[PDB]
Amino acid sequence: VNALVSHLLVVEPEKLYAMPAVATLCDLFDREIVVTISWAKSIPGFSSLSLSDQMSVLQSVWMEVLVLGVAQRSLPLQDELAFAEDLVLDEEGARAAGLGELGAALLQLVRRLQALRLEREEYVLLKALALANSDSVHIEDAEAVEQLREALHEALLEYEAGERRRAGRLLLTLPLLRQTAGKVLAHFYGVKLEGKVPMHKLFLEMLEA
């Protein structure tokens, strides 16, 4: 067993539960951002980064962490997206709920991950890797963030060593994760431009960041 892997499993947030349609998601995402922040600080090596680098990283990868959570939760299902343990909507309702076509984009990520039957341990390592793979131009100590990236990368290889083959297939899904996070951002950014749908301060701040 890997030391870092067990730690990631321990600091893994508890199941999420639902708290209109777009309105509920905006509020649910606002809360998840809070959970993500505490989660990050719990990761060995994240807290060692300067405060500004901690900000820059979170500001540029928070949506990927969120989207990956949605996908992980949707794995057991088919053609459905579980934004919460008690909040699931088919690709149809997604449209009805006023989510443009993010549902299809999201399910595309879900299917890519389903094809690999992502195990619990791989899920947590991948999520941590996503956080540590930020390409925020605002980062100051790129050598430090990199060091964190490599530690997690090493953990993944050791884990798979039960490696590089399976490890790489997991990493090859990251481009889609980022692109998917990008579409979710652009959608909800426009959802705040309509003004009609309400949303907290944090979520609004993170969207424009």
Binding site: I37, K41, Q54, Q59
Partner: peptide, 13 residues
Amino acid sequence: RPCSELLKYLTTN
């Protein structure tokens, strides 16, 4: 540098 809300959580419990 709009990030006051985020800082609030970065510097707490």
